[PDB]
Amino acid sequence: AMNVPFWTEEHVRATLPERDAESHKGTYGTALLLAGSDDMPGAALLAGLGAMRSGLGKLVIGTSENVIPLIVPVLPEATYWRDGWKKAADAQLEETYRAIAIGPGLPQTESVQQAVDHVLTADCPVILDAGALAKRTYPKREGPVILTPHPGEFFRMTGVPVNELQKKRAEYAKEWAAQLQTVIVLKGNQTVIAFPDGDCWLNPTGNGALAKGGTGDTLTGMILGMLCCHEDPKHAVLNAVYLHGACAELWTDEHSAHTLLAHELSDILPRVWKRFE
Amino acid sequence: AMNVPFWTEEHVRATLPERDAESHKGTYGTALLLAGSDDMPGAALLAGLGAMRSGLGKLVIGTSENVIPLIVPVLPEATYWRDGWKKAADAQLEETYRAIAIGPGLPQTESVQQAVDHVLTADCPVILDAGALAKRTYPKREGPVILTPHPGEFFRMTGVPVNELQKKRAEYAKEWAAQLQTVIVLKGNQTVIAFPDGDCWLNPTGNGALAKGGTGDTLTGMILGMLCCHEDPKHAVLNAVYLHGACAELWTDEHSAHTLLAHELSDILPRVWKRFE
Amino acid sequence: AMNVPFWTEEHVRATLPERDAESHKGTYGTALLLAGSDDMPGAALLAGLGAMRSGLGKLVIGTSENVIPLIVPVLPEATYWRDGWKKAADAQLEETYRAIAIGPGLPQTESVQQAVDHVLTADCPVILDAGALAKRTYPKREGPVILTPHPGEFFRMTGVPVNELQKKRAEYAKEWAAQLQTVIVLKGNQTVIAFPDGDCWLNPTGNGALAKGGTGDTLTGMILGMLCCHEDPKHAVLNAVYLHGACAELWTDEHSAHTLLAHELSDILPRVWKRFE
Amino acid sequence: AMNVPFWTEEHVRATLPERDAESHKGTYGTALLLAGSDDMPGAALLAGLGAMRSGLGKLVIGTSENVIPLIVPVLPEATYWRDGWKKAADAQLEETYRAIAIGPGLPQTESVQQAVDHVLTADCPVILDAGALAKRTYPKREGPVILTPHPGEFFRMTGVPVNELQKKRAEYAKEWAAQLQTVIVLKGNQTVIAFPDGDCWLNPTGNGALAKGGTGDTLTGMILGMLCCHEDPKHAVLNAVYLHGACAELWTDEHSAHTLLAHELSDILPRVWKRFE
Numbered sequence A, B, C, D: 001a002m003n004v005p006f007w008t009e010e011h012v013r014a015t016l017p018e019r020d021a022e023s024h025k026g027t028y029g030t031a032l033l034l035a036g037s038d039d040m041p042g043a044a045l046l047a048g049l050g051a052m053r054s055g056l057g058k059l060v061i062g063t064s065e066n067v068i069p070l071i072v073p074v075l076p077e078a079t080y081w082r083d084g085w086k087k088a089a090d091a092q093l094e095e096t097y098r099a100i101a102i103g104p105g106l107p108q109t110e111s112v113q114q115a116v117d118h119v120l121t122a123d124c125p126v127i128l129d130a131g132a133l134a135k136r137t138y139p140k141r142e143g144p145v146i147l148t149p150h151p152g153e154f155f156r157m158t159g160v161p162v163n164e165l166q167k168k169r170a171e172y173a174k175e176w177a178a179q180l181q182t183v184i185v186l187k188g189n190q191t192v193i194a195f196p197d198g199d200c201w202l203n204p205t206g207n208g209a210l211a212k213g214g215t216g217d218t219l220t221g222m223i224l225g226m227l228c229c230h231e232d233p234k235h236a237v238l239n240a241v242y243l244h245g246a247c248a249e250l251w252t253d254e255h256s257a258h259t260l261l262a263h264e265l266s267d268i269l270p271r272v273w274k275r276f277e
């Protein structure tokens, strides 16, 4: 209806970063992932894997103490801020991060919102997902704030019921990205990527293999890592959403769309990303 | 003897569901798996993997607290109801699930039966396996009840000794499916799928690679997930049993039948399912 | 010197068992593995994997309580006898097993020997390895007792120093198999398989990829599982030793012999075993 | 500027060791890895995997008690010295090791330095990395001491600021290897391998896929294992650095350089090492 353009292969190819011979991990920065709780621990592993796969230099995972041991054998390259998402409720971050994501596997509580407020005083891009998504406003700051709601969370954020949202996805995503002055990645088939400056795109990749628990946690991590290796955070978000969907498409070439497990998206991304280089 | 027909490839191909571009995980529903105990923890992982592989939208695993950490690194896409199979002994389920399975890795106790009674008040299809299999009757309810006994459990349920059962497998499975008004998946070579309306089929797939611990826990999960993505729960059960056996057959093309580990069935299913699309 | 014959491919091909369509896991039996302690936990996982890969029907692992959680995510098909190797010091086994292995990852203590004495009152074949190897004698019983020493353990058992042993491997292995009335699998290049009835063979397979921690724990498990699916326990031992070495040879076709990790032997065995069918 | 030669393929091919049919694990020795702490546990797994992959006979990991369970399911071939890096602060090592590495995942504390002093009284080669790197001097002893700093750690050790170091990498590495009488592996593109006898080489392999957390922990382990299977420890260090970089190059043939996870280097090494045989 609004003729929102697709973020195409040609756009991905033109904007994906190089990883130079002369580079060191500091070039690609340290990300912080605030995720995973005692009954939703897996989100931390999914987002962690997505993030380390996606071109950062280092990852610190601020997860609950009991979640840490569940991540290490699979992703031994991450380090930890013990109970970090809880600690973030109480004070400003003291360390500097290239990008921060908060919310996968966190409960929808006021303490999580207090952590969100403290994280927003950092200068870097910040992603809010899952439990960190609420009906709220956002303070003027330097770096972008990137909200990644599925339609139900969009309802939680805006009061737009899902049946209404789905009739006019881009129009609502653009309106609320403008109102909130946040990026909104509105999930679904033809995911909408709406920017607060009015730019908006649709994602052309993906399929129903993604319609299963965990694939959004993986996407949050992919965005987090891409924010670390792209100079332009807009391109980071767009490329993450694109490549995430492209991994599901590779999967369905030889596997049934009913059978994908989200973590596998992260196993697929290395080969998929190569093809766009 | 009763000329029970085989559930053939043509029947599988005709009944397996599509996963549409327009679908979201809610289309495919949330399953509940009540499984895994302190000395039989592995059943929860096996059934969990089978279920998430088999086309559901979300999985909640109600397992013992100490089992949770054993699942997460392998299946980070599941979420948890802490001590859920124990809690289910005490009250009705408050949440709505598309399908429920109970029993893999649970002890054969009265408390497990109390959980079975509470789960049966939900409206959805319910699978009973392993520890949840007992000599008992079942209340009239909407959704099917699906019993998945091996011959020894069939003896436990009915008093038909195994040596007698095995002479007349389909005849006993049909008689007891009718008597109990439950589906009975009577395991073994040429697994019998007997419906309480008198329909009955034999499964043509599988081999002795399946004759090892854990392959039935995997099947329970496969049924659970297929109940979530098939409109017709009869087809869900039939296709699960079929594809489960078909995975063992793929395995023996290049691997010895002595050497399969059950979890691998779940690794194989993505490619096997593709071939029937 | 004694012209001990090699257990050749032709002998393996002639003696490896079928896994019939009509079989059920009870045909292949339940094995017991008594292994793994707090500072040597990994032996339980290695032997467990070897055993479940090698044609048994079920595996019970009697390991230390803290070891259990380390096995489950990798080998969810095993079930547990909590603190079983310790409990076995105190009383006779109450359950019937097709075969029992004791020792990988256990300390060389008198309590382990007390467990060995209790296990020997069962009727089945029993394997003793690692910590269960000591200077001792063995009671007359039905089933074979299979000792699997490396040269250092052979010294511990017999007082024959390693430098002397290695000059006359088969002669010492045969002499002590006769004296003790046990099978002795004397490890090394050209592993000796000496039977107490005077039969003796050399193993022709394997290479220096096996000269690393854990490969013997894996072999113990392989013997354990093969004792469950072979009618003739002599053939079980011979085939296990052979196929174990054959897996190392497959590995070195495309990988450096310096780089094998023992658990991988178990990943390789499915394809290797197929080729001998 | 100093015309430091590259350690080339021809040099690797000429110096890599054989793994003879007649060898036993004692030929290849027991390594000790003192690594991994509660908030940096993953370094122990990464270095452990690197070391066991790299031709040793046995590995003992002296890690924190809570780290042990995180390693076992992935690397069940290692055994443990419980809280070993902490215990090493208090007394001389009682056991003999072929090589020792200390530091990955350890804090930069005085107690770690006390462990370093105790480890240096052993006769064998010793690697110091990460937390074990400090501004200090080293006692005359038999075996080489191998420091593996990235530029920031080199600054910590020497006071040479990173911006200055990077202009004259080999000149500074050679000067300080001479001053300290240690080997210095100065990490980065064209890693410098400076020996205290004045020999110096550059490493020609690797790429920016290595510019991510954990790849240096993996290298520490690779050096540790290669010190066990090379007679000449100089060649061990050179070959480790070379093959480590060569694994990143294999990865980028079909995968994006942004996407490598360090542990995968260890999965790649078996095939890469084969090609240099």
Ligand SMILES: Nc1ncnc2c1ncn2[C@@H]1O[C@H](COP(=O)(O)OP(=O)(O)OC[C@H]2O[C@@H](O)[C@H](O)[C@@H]2O)[C@@H](O)[C@H]1O
Residues within 6 Å of the ligand: A040, A042, A043, A105, A130, A150, A186, A187, A188, A189, A190, A191, A205, A206, A207, A208, A209, A210, A211, A212, A213, A214, A215, A216, A217, A218, A219, A245, B020, B021, B022, B023, B024, B025, B058, B076, B077, B078, B079
């Ligand atoms: N039909 C489709 N076509 C293309 N993309 C799709 C489709 N359906 C879903 N997707 C994509 O799948 C992802 C779904 O993300 P979420 O809804 O956030 O899923 P997620 O929150 O990970 O999972 C739900 C829950 O299960 C748990 O495993 C997880 O921790 C969470 O609590 C989005 O990228 C979305 O665009």
Ligand SMILES: Nc1ncnc2c1ncn2[C@@H]1O[C@H](COP(=O)(O)OP(=O)(O)OC[C@H]2O[C@@H](O)[C@H](O)[C@@H]2O)[C@@H](O)[C@H]1O
Residues within 6 Å of the ligand: B040, B042, B043, B105, B130, B150, B186, B187, B188, B189, B190, B191, B205, B206, B207, B208, B209, B210, B211, B212, B213, B214, B215, B216, B217, B218, B219, B245, C020, C021, C022, C023, C024, C025, C058, C076, C077, C078, C079
């Ligand atoms: N010869 C055969 N041909 C075809 N299918 C077969 C054959 N033998 C067995 N099967 C199939 O293998 C499966 C066996 O299921 P169960 O008997 O339920 O096995 P399961 O309960 O998983 O394992 C036994 C025990 O070991 C533990 O790992 C597990 O938790 C359980 O306690 C069934 O689908 C059955 O039809």
Ligand SMILES: Nc1ncnc2c1ncn2[C@@H]1O[C@H](COP(=O)(O)OP(=O)(O)OC[C@H]2O[C@@H](O)[C@H](O)[C@@H]2O)[C@@H](O)[C@H]1O
Residues within 6 Å of the ligand: C040, C042, C043, C105, C130, C150, C186, C187, C188, C189, C190, C191, C205, C206, C207, C208, C209, C210, C211, C212, C213, C214, C215, C216, C217, C218, C219, C245, D020, D021, D022, D023, D024, D025, D058, D076, D077, D078, D079
């Ligand atoms: N050069 C060779 N050629 C052929 N086979 C060989 C060779 N070298 C060793 N092997 C074979 O490798 C195996 C070695 O077994 P063990 O000596 O028992 O090794 P294992 O006890 O597993 O490992 C030593 C220690 O490290 C730990 O990981 C493990 O738990 C144990 O404490 C035997 O099958 C042996 O014949």
Ligand SMILES: Nc1ncnc2c1ncn2[C@@H]1O[C@H](COP(=O)(O)OP(=O)(O)OC[C@H]2O[C@@H](O)[C@H](O)[C@@H]2O)[C@@H](O)[C@H]1O
Residues within 6 Å of the ligand: A020, A021, A022, A023, A024, A025, A058, A076, A077, A078, A079, D040, D042, D043, D105, D130, D150, D186, D187, D188, D189, D190, D191, D205, D206, D207, D208, D209, D210, D211, D212, D213, D214, D215, D216, D217, D218, D219, D245
């Ligand atoms: N552009 C490049 N070209 C070639 N090699 C490179 C390049 N960039 C880095 N490398 C190589 O990558 C390795 C980096 O090692 P470290 O800096 O020690 O990295 P490491 O300490 O493992 O990781 C940093 C932190 O993250 C955690 O996961 C880890 O435990 C540690 O705390 C070295 O071998 C280095 O030469």
Ligand SMILES: [Mg+2]
Residues within 6 Å of the ligand: A130, A150, A216, A217
């Ligand atoms: Mg989500």
Ligand SMILES: [Mg+2]
Residues within 6 Å of the ligand: B130, B150, B216, B217
């Ligand atoms: Mg069963």
Ligand SMILES: [Mg+2]
Residues within 6 Å of the ligand: C130, C150, C216, C217
């Ligand atoms: Mg041994």
Ligand SMILES: [Mg+2]
Residues within 6 Å of the ligand: D130, D150, D216, D217
């Ligand atoms: Mg480092």
